[PDB]
Amino acid sequence: MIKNEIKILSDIEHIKKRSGMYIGSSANEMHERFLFGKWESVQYVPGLVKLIDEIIDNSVDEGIRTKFKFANKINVTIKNNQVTVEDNGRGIPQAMVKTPTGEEIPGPVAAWTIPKAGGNFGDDKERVTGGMNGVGSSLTNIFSVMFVGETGDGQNNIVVRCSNGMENKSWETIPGKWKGTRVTFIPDFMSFETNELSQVYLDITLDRLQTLAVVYPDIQFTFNGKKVQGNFKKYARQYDEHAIVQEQENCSIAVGRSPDGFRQLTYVNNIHTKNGGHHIDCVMDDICEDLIPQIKRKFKIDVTKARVKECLTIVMFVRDMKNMRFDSQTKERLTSPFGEIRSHIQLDAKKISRAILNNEAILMPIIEAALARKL
């Protein structure tokens, strides 16, 4: 007898109880990843990072929605454990919405306090925003001791003041000409194996904002008062001095050395696919299938597709993909159809193949054991 008693859970309850299917690990652990081009190994709690990224994602969504005519200044601030994200998008439409449970609640209130409530539930094939599930804001709110969202459309502002894991919710409206979005929160450090939003979280969010600045040059980000600049070839050279780049229509990619296994920083629209997934798998495949031809052809050697890739760092931004799909709320693994991906990425792997064959620093580790095993 382990009891098998059936119980039913509210959305908020379920978010609290199965938090890691919603935001990730609470534990303060050591992960390997990229910071400023360096494959370091650093200690953070992944869920805390997500709490920030949700609010950022939302602003960058609005920039996307309006082709950067709106939300082209995004101001991020991290000061004594308080995260502030301000943008100049159009604000959250203040119109009201009806929940099936009778109630009648202002637009932004539901956006921020009701899971399964957002503005990315349209025709999937046309959805270009990184946002889609309608939950990430409520996640930051549910895991915040204080959460305060301010939007205004140019007419009036609504403030939604939330405390203690969104069990205190209140909202007021006052007229105003301001038009944009501000969100401020303090994480609930009881759901996390830290008690401080210490310096590493500052490093990550800057690093994220640097990467967002190169995907999205029409947005001027600022972190803690300092504007974030961006030049893609400059960015890429942070990962390997001896890197090489190619930029297409819906694509910017860079290839460089790795000392210790395939590494990849890889973006799909405004989303960091830290676990890779289909897009990077497919382009590494199309890459390797011109390379191993030429390499076995230029040198008569056999090297494996794992050998090629266990020596590359890759950086790839895919812009403007419709209806992108993932296997988790954490959007860490692009899971869209291989065919539709390959339709968007117009990858000239031929190009990319010849330039990697003409870059000794990059080419040599691939074929090295193979050449030394030939004699």
Q: Which is nearer to ligand ANP, 73 or 354 (CB)?
A: 73
Say if CB 158 and CB 109 are below 8 A apart: yes
Say if CB 61 and CB 120 are below 8 A apart: yes
Say if CB 212 and CB 221 are below 8 A apart: yes
Closest separation in Å from C-beta 233 to a copy of itself: 28
Is 310 annotated as a binding-site member?
A: no
Give the residue, chosen from 144, 181, 211, 336, that forms a contact with ligand ANP under the rule CB under 6 A: 181
**Does residue 118 belong to the site contacting ligand ANP (CB under 6 A)?**
yes
Q: How many residues bind a copy of itself (CB under 8 A)?
A: 77
Residue range at the interface with Mg ion (CB under 5 A); choices 134-142, 185-193, 198-206, 316-324 = 134-142
Partner touching 175 among ligand ANP, Mg ion, a copy of itself, none, CB below 5 to 8 Å by kind? none
**Does residue 252 belong to the site contacting ligand ANP (CB under 6 A)?**
no
**Does residue 62 belong to the site contacting ligand ANP (CB under 6 A)?**
yes
Is 54 annotated as a binding-site member?
A: yes
Cα-based angle 276, 278, 279 (whole degrees, multiple of 5): 80
Q: Which is nearer to a copy of itself, 52 or 92 (CB)?
A: 92
Phi, psi (degrees; rounded to nearest 5) at 44:
-150, 170
Taking each helix axis from N to C terminus, what angle separates 199-215 and 46-65, rounded to the nearest 10 degrees? 30
Supply 280's token pair: 């990077």
Q: Which is nearer to a copy of itself, 310 or 348 (CB)?
A: 310
Q: What is the Cα–Cα distance from 215 to 232, expressed in whole angstroms?
A: 8
Site for a copy of itself in 48-87 (CB under 8 A): 62, 64-66
**Does residue 133 belong to the site contacting a copy of itself (CB under 8 A)?**
yes
Query: Of 128, 350, 352, 126, which is closest to residue 252 (Cα–Cα)?
Result: 352
Q: What is the Cα–Cα distance from 187 to 139, expressed in whole angstroms?
A: 11
CA 336 vs. chain centroid, Å, equals 16
**Does residue 332 belong to the site contacting Mg ion (CB under 5 A)?**
no
Q: What is the Cα–Cα distance from 331 to 324, expressed in whole angstroms?
A: 10
Site for a copy of itself in 273-312 (CB under 8 A): 275, 304-306, 310
Give the residue, chosen from 55, 78, 85, 132, that forms a contact with a copy of itself under the rule CB under 8 A: 132
Coil, helix or strand at residue 367:
helix
Partner touching 306 among ligand ANP, a copy of itself, Mg ion, none, CB below 5 to 8 Å by kind? a copy of itself
Give the residue, chosen from 54, 150, 240, 290, that forms a contact with Mg ion under the rule CB under 5 A: 54
Phi, psi (degrees; rounded to nearest 5) at 184:
-130, 135
Coil, helix or strand at residue 74:
strand
**Does residue 101 belong to the site contacting ligand ANP (CB under 6 A)?**
no
**Does residue 57 belong to the site contacting Mg ion (CB under 5 A)?**
yes
Residues that bind Mg ion (CB under 5 A): 54, 57-58, 131, 136
| Binding region for Mg(2+) | 54, 57
